[PDB]
Design a protein around this ligand. Structure first.
Ligand code: 9UG
Length: 116
């Protein structure tokens, strides 16, 4: 149990999010919210109940809307789980998601220990 300052969470967690942005082109389909009408995928919101993307996570850090570090981690995992759920395992976006998940898994473990 701990009260976290939003600036403390930003300085600690934003580097792990930037490590995902730096993956090019793997991060490109994750940088903005999925737009099913534009992309022609009307079943997306049938499958994905709670969408999440990098720009939404970044804004929540910038505005202090995470109270605790595990809320940030849950949003990153939600973004990954949505992409693995909707896209087929042979697809470009599914393989992109696995690469981003590999990067995040290596970045987030010591950061979470330092925060407590
Ligand atoms: C995590 N992204 C994602 O699931 N999608 C759905 C997939 C069918 O293709 C996409 C293409 C573009 C340009 C942006 C997002 C996506």
């Amino acid at each position: 149990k701990k009260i976290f300052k939003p600036e403390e969470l930003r300085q600690a967690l934003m580097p792990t999010l930037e490590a995902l942005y730096r993956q090019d082109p793997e991060s490109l389909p994750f940088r903005q919210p999925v737009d099913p009408q534009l992309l022609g995928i009307p079943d997306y919101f049938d499958i994905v109940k709670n969408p999440m993307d990098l720009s939404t996570i970044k804004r929540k850090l910038d505005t202090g809307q995470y109270q605790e570090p595990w809320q940030y981690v849950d949003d990153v995992w939600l973004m990954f789980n949505n992409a693995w759920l909707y896209n087929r395992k042979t697809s470009r976006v599914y393989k992109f998601c696995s690469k981003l998940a590999e990067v995040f898994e290596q970045e987030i473990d010591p950061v979470m220990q330092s925060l407590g």
